[PDB]
Design a protein around this ligand. Structure first.
Ligand code: NP6
Ligand code: CA
Length: 578
């Protein structure tokens, strides 16, 4: 079960999904939840509803008193799916669908609710914006994983940024947004429309209600949640009193005047500790003057950082509310030549009460981002039960059941950022790291390497090639495969290089060695070709893979083995990989 319930009792028996059922509550439970339920089955009583519905009266003491909470029960005589509110019943069904395997249900009893109020994704990365279809797919994935939040803002959409923010959406674009909003609604996600006025806004009555008027227009289109960004604001616009006053005005005239506005969030100009002036008074001012119903976004101690108890105390003390965390992972828009497919880890698991929200900023690779996104959904719903490694594997098995082992193999070796401008790193290839390290230490001093570590490495390379070739031809998730194809090609080429280098280590004779050596040089050059021709971008063009442990192991083994050959046969073979 992902995310894992707050409370779960499994009774060790298993019942059949009823051949014949009595559906009680179908006309008064959340229609989004009923829709899912009716999809799941084509007599035994099944009761669906929210606290206060007639249909769930019997079980209202079992329904948790938390927003988005629910009670779920399965046993011999009946099935209960009962939310504390509408979204909660929908969340009951997302768990129910995960329990239902081969027409059979386990006998269980669940009491569940989220530890973090707002959970989901911010579309805030640089690079090729996601397509329309990518976003419809993301929205459905958020619903399944009980993420309640999507902060919109594609960079090819000019009507949320300076200067066309003042201007309303054109007809054809409007209807597309409208489709996003509708799909979000259906999946119980708050479509949060973010405005980015900072670049060209003035503190005067005119810009003041061009914003209001814009929000109203967005309201007519179905938008029920809103964000305002000040990260990019300049000059007098960095005044926290002026910012507070604008947002409070938006709160007073709009958020509190409308019946059904959910989220209202702002991004401050000081959005991490290291970009905060110690002598200034930006955040305390903002925290004193901003209405209490308005969230303040925060990335932690640095632009890229994992959230700690000290970090969250330091900010919460100043804005006088629990920070709304923006986590800059797996976003790779500053290491564009890397894919970040590793586990999600580093965030403190005891600090749920200290955060109002937790949203991840993903990659420009929408589908490849689902691994971290699923993990974040799991962390933010139940941090205290959060299992990094198990959640990673579940995500992979969920995203690509037909080739889960292959995707795991691939992702294990595509997780580190490599060295970069934020100094942010992730672990990679941990499984084979000790075998690598030993081999490298031993071999380098003509002191025998272990046969078992040689075999581990051989085994790895063989497995990488199989994984790579299976992944290329996989048709269960074509969008995913299209995103990762350049890296998969490069990852395969890496595996081949490693195999040929290991045949150089086992050097049989002079002729065979030179054959292997020429093949490695040719393979290097194919890697360079892909790096010069795929994923070209002004910032970090190209395709890097297996960069933490595996490629340095291969480069060094190659450099070393060529050195020994130059010594033994008086040759001058090039020993570089550069
Ligand atoms: C509240 C978060 C704001 C944020 O994260 N902004 C950008 C962001 N900014 O990072 C910077 O280093 N920005 C910056 C640095 C110097 C001067 C101005 C901005 O980091 C992310 C990762 O690359 C980008 O995807 C974001 O769009
Ligand atoms: Ca109801």
């Amino acid at each position: 079960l992902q995310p894992p319930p707050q409370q779960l009792i499994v009774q060790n028996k298993t019942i059949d999904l009823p051949a014949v059922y009595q559906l009680n509550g179908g006309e008064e439970a959340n229609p989004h939840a009923v829709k899912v339920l009716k999809e799941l089955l084509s007599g035994m009583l099944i009761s669906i509803g929210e606290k206060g519905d007639k249909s769930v009266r019997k079980y209202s003491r079992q329904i948790p008193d938390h927003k988005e909470g629910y009670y779920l029960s399965v046993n011999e005589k009946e099935i209960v799916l009962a939310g504390n509110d509408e979204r909660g019943t929908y969340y009951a069904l997302q768990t129910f669908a995960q329990l239902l395997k081969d027409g059979k249900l386990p006998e269980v009893e669940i009491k569940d609710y989220p530890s973090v109020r707002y959970r989901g994704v911010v579309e805030g990365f640089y690079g090729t914006p996601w397509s329309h279809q990518a976003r419809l797919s993301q929205l459905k994935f958020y619903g399944k994983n009980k993420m309640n939040t999507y902060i919109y803002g594609p960079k090819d959409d000019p009507y949320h940024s300076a200067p066309n923010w003042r201007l309303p959406y054109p007809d054809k674009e409007a209807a597309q947004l409208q489709e996003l909003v509708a799909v979000a609604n259906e999946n119980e996600v708050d479509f949060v429309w973010a405005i980015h006025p900072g670049q060209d806004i003035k503190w005067n009555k005119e810009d003041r209600d061009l914003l209001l008027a814009k929000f109203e227009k967005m309201y007519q289109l179905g938008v029920r949640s809103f964000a305002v960004f000040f990260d990019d604001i300049s000059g007098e616009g960095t005044n926290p009193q002026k910012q507070a006053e604008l947002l409070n005005y938006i709160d007073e005239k709009f958020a509190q005047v409308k019946p059904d506005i959910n989220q209202l969030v702002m991004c401050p100009t000081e959005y991490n500790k290291s970009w905060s002036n110690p002598n200034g008074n930006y955040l305390t001012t903002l925290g004193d003057k901003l209405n209490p119903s308005i969230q303040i976004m925060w990335t932690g101690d640095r632009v890229i950082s994992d959230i700690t108890r000290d970090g969250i105390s330091w900010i919460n003390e100043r804005i006088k509310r629990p920070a709304y965390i923006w986590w800059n992972f797996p976003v790779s828009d500053y290491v564009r030549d890397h894919l970040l497919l590793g586990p999600v880890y580093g965030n403190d698991t005891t600090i749920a009460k200290e955060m109002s929200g937790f949203v991840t900023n993903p990659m420009e690779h929408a589908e490849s981002s689902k691994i971290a996104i699923y993990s974040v959904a799991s962390y933010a719903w139940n941090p205290a039960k959060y299992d990094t490694w198990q959640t990673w594997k579940d995500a992979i098995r969920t995203i690509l059941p037909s080739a889960a082992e292959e995707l795991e193999c691939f992702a294990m070796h595509n997780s580190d950022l490599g060295p970069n401008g934020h100094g942010y790193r992730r672990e990679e290839s941990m499984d084979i790291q000790p075998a690598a390290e030993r081999f490298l230490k031993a071999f380098k001093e003509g002191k025998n390497y272990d046969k078992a570590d040689f075999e581990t490495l051989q085994y790895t390379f063989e497995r990488m090639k199989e994984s790579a070739d299976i992944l290329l031809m996989n048709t269960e998730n074509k969008p995913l495969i299209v995103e990762i194809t350049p890296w998969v090609h490069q990852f395969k080429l890496t595996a081949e290089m490693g195999e040929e280098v290991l045949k150089m280590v086992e050097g049989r004779n002079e002729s065979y060695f030179l054959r292997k050596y020429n093949h490695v040089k040719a393979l290097q050059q194919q890697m360079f070709y892909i790096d010069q021709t795929s994923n070209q971008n002004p910032y970090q063009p190209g395709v890097k893979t297996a960069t933490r442990v595996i490629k340095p192991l291969i480069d060094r083994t190659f450099a070393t083995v060529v050195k020994f050959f130059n010594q033994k046969f008086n040759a001058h073979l090039d020993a570089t990989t550069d």
